[PDB]
């Protein structure tokens, strides 16, 4: 017959990391298999069109990488600029917005993230640069962040005017079922907690260098695959030697061709295995990129009601940050604290009628009965305006004797 | 020619970019949208005068200046 | 010779314990699952809250509680009987094993 | 060759199983611990628990 | 100008099954390919990794 209602809350900010893109690789099959040997090329010509398929697959992967990046980032039509004012109602955004003085237009957190992953094989193997440079990605992220902060709910509506931040916070508080007056009465404390959480995140990022394991894994896997492909050249696969010139200068054509065929078969198998594994990994990366784009759309541009989709707790807002081959999200949530026990009831039994609250629960400390919201303690005197009348005092199980008051009569008779 | 500098390309209208050296393109220092991607933020298009290449840096969009009132 | 099967890290007893803990938490704490709380919210209150969640007033549940409980128990019993009768319900996992 | 074929098939099956496990985790989080309003995501009809 | 409004309802319970995990398998390549024969292992040594 009891219930606990929070009398305090806190603001928490958490981090999320999602890989997006992958390194682009182009491989020349002929140079890898039968490099600088025209006779080896003539022998390989008997195998038809094996190399073209691998080249086409690698080209498709390379195109898909840029498509993934474009899908994730390029979502805003225009470019907003950093507001020259810093009157955000006490909230601090200096550590996230770009520094006008720095040569590169990153922020402190972005600089730390980029520095956190600072840690030949050209034989026919080449790496192509991405279509979008890091500066363009940072510009897109800054434009998104500035536009969101400045506009609020009028972001993608062309002509707009700066909506005050406190109104956006009040709207978000209304989103989770808390009356807006709480923010207007605890603005300073909320801002202080938010700033402290941001500082704690910055300190944690600056302390440990093992927080970007998700991207480090992708980088290491690609590097190891390329290392294995390179190291495969030294094998002989049962032939006389691993050098074409040795076979040419040591054996007669009729069996030198056999040795060359053996080497060709081995190298073709290695190339095929590498290409297939790259295809599978690219599919996984594409799935991750789709998830990242969905999260961007559903979290940065609006408030989400899905449970545990934006971190633990009731979602308020989130901010994006760039990263090497990935993104970083900073989710800001709401966590109630300091629960206190109370005694409750399902209904109030008046003179023959039953009363149910419009929105809230019936609570009492032993003598007085109040109606209050569910995620914050704020009692009010029970009134005929707060309730809703239906039925009698017979069917409800656990109904409680009390009195419902009306302020209309004291004004009517005065 | 991808990944090489044209100080040695005549062996096998010039302009050196971050993706190689481009032959037959007219360099401009304006900014437009991308019609044909090249790499490293460089994009090419056909606009007239005869219809010739123009090689330009990519543009991310148009600026929006929202006024500032609290 | 070369083929070997390694055991899972979590034994099924631990999985059953995790499931039971989740069920008990969601059946006792109600909407205060995760925070301090540590008190039992009445079940009918959670039912009324979720009834309101789909645009139905709470009086409906508070007046039909007995019928609602009987229907829920009957549905649970029917599911148990159906599981005990038909042997071709877990094909989704049977296919993976096969 | 037989070993290579078996390994590739196992890798593809592992990818499918991982996708299914992600779906299961999402369903647990959005249905056991809260009320879902997505239509037909948590049963046929209006969802309660 | 006609509408239909229900005057009664029912409570239904359904079932949903989702696979989560596969079976872990480890394979020794040398034993499978060239088991117990050292000549076969010596020949396999030239094939790489
Ligand atoms: C909330 O918002 C307020 C503004 O409304 C910020 O207030 C100022 O913020 C700036 C930038 O964070 C602070 O400047 C930094 O101060 C650091 C410490 O300063 C003390 O120690 C130095 C010794 O070197 C003294 O010279 C100085 O007078 C202070 O006594 C410096 O170490 C920083 O230098 C580093 O950053 C700058 C870029 O800002 C680089 O150019 C430098 O090379 C160096 O890398 C920097 O100068 C400033 O002190 C704050 N003032 C006040 C009154 O608060 C809050 O910082 C902000 N809080 C959060 C959490 O965001
Ligand atoms: C909504 O539909 C259901 C099912 O059609 C209705 O349930 C039925 O309710 C009536 C009275 O509420 C039950 O009659 C009673 O049956 C018991 C046991 O037989 C008997 O002892 C009583 O004297 C009385 O006759 C009826 O049995 C029950 N149906 C079943 C299958 O059990 C329900 O009433 C409907 N709701 C409304 C608001 O009409
Ligand atoms: C929640 O608890 C905190 C304690 O950390 C309260 O913060 C105190 O607030 C009062 C007035 O608002 C100040 O005089 C104290 O100095 C604060 N204490 C600390 C440690 O900062 C906060 O007020 C509580 N929430 C509510 C709504 O009362
Ligand atoms: C307090 O509860 C008692 C139940 O014991 C109510 O008493 C009944 O009231 C009705 C009309 O209000 C009478 O017809 C019954 O004869 C009363 N029964 C008894 C045993 O006294 C009482 O009305 C309730 N008071 C309030 C303010 O709700
Ligand atoms: C393309 O490669 C050639 C290789 O010789 C570069 O020529 C020299 O490059 C180094 C640094 O890469 C400079 O310090 C030298 O001054 C260059 N030589 C001369 C004579 O200037 C060439 O610079 C490269 N192209 C670009 C755009 O970097
Ligand atoms: C608070 O109420 C709970 C019942 O919900 C009870 O178990 C506990 O002892 C109470 N604590 C105090 C300090 O009254
Ligand atoms: C219960 O709370 C109300 C409002 O704060 C107060 O008037 C009343 O005295 C309290 N009862 C007790 C027993 O403290
Ligand atoms: C709590 O349980 C007691 C008996 O254990 C019962 O009398 C009481 O009515 C219950 N509480 C409510 C609110 O019904
Ligand atoms: C482009 O660069 C040239 C030389 O660097 C300069 O003369 C010209 O004015 C520039 N174009 C524009 C539009 O400024």
Numbering used by the authors:
A (entry chain C): 710 to 828, 853 to 1147
B (entry chain B): 612 to 623, 641 to 676, 688 to 709
C (entry chain A): 856 to 953
D (entry chain A): 1002 to 1050
E (entry chain A): 710 to 758
Paper text:
The S glycoprotein is composed of S1 and S2 subunits that mediate host-cell attachment to initiate virus-cell fusion. The S1 subunit comprises the N-terminal domain (NTD) and the receptor binding domain (RBD) with subdomains SD1 and SD2 undergoing hinge-like motions that promote RBD movement between closed and opened conformations. Engagement of the RBD open conformation with human angiotensin-converting enzyme 2 receptor (hACE2) triggers a large-scale conformational rearrangement in the S2 domain, which contains the fusion machinery necessary to mediate viral fusion and infectivity. S2D14, which contains 20 computationally designed mutations within the S2 domain and a rationally engineered D614G mutation in the SD2 domain, has an ~11-fold increase in protein yield and retains RBD antigenicity.
To better understand the molecular basis for the improved breadth and immunogenicity of S2D14, a more extensive cryo-EM dataset was collected for high-resolution structural analysis using a Titan Krios 300-kV electron microscope. Cryo–electron microscopy structures reveal a mixture of populations in various RBD conformational states. (B) The cryo-EM structure of S2D14 in the two-RBD open conformations (3.1-Å resolution) was the dominant population and represents 43% of total particles. Although this final class most closely aligned to the one-RBD open mask used during focused classification, two of the RBDs lacked clear density suggesting a state with two dynamic RBDs, each sampling an RBD open state, yet distinguishable from the two-RBD open structure. Together, these conformations reveal that ~66% of particles contain at least two RBDs in the open or exposed states and are consistent with binding to hACE2 and CR3022. Docking of Fabs S309 (64), S2X259, or S2K146 (25, 26) onto S2D14 confirms that neutralization-sensitive RBD epitopes, in particular those exposed only in an RBD open state (recognized by S2X259 and S2K146), are accessible with no apparent clashes. (E) Docking of Fabs of S309 (left), S2X259 (center), and S2K146 (right) onto S2D14 in the two-RBD open conformation confirms the accessibility of these broadly neutralizing RBD epitopes. The 23 total mutations (20 PROSS designed mutations, D614G, K986P, and V987P) present in S2D14 are all well resolved with clear side chain densities. Analysis of the structures provides molecular details for the three main types of mutations incorporated by the evolutionary consensus design: (i) improvement of complementary electrostatic potential between interprotomer contact regions, (ii) optimization of hydrophobicity and van der Waals (VDW) contacts, and/or (iii) introduction of hydrogen bond interactions. For example, the mutation T998N introduces a hydrogen bond between the asparagine oxygen with the side chain of Y756, located on the same protomer, while the mutation T1027E within the CH forms a hydrogen bonding network between the E1027 side chain and R1039 of an adjacent S protomer.
